[PDB]
Amino acid sequence: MSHTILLVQPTKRPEGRTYADYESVNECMEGVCKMYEEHLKRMNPNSPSITYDISQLFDFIDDLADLSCLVYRADTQTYQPYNKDWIKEKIYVLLRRQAQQA
Questions:
Q1: Most distant CA atoms of the chain, gap in Å
Q2: List the disulfide bonds.
Q3: Which residues partner with 5 through β-bridges?
Q4: Which residues contact 35 (CB under 8 A, 6 or more apart)?
Q5: Alpha-carbon torsion, ordered 28, 29, 33, 34, to 10 deg
């Protein structure tokens, strides 16, 4: 698995820049969905389930001022960068697999 770092900046405000790290690319993508999920729970404290469609996720990601990831390559002991659109496609594929399973 490749160690992965996610850099997020929610708004134009520089002090909001944050990061988190994961043991793999798929756990980082799941981390992106968890970010949106905890945002929806803040907003909806009294909804029993947090439910959302993939279009709502994608608009949330598009609205971030910035989102990128760095993925460790054993090859060169270095990190390959990938942009917001790459991220969205991995989450697409991930969420599409689960939907098939069901």
A1: 48
A2: none
A3: 21, 70
A4: 8
A5: -20
If one counts the domains in the chain, the total is 1
- 32's CB contacts (< 8 A; 6+ apart) are 6, 61, 67, 87, 91
Resolution (A): 2.0
Which token pair is 84? 């917001």
d(CA 5, CA 81): 9
CB-count exposure of residue 67 (10 Å: 0-12, 13-18, 19+): buried
CATH classification of the domain holding 61? 3.30.2260.10
Query: What are the angstrom distances between the C-alpha of 85 and each of 14, 44, 58, 74?
Result: 21, 28, 10, 24
**Is the distance from CB of 18 to CB of 68 less than 8 angstroms?**
no
Pair of tokens at residue 32: 């992106």
| Coil/strand/helix, residue 91 | helix
Domain enclosing residue 36, as ranges: 1-102
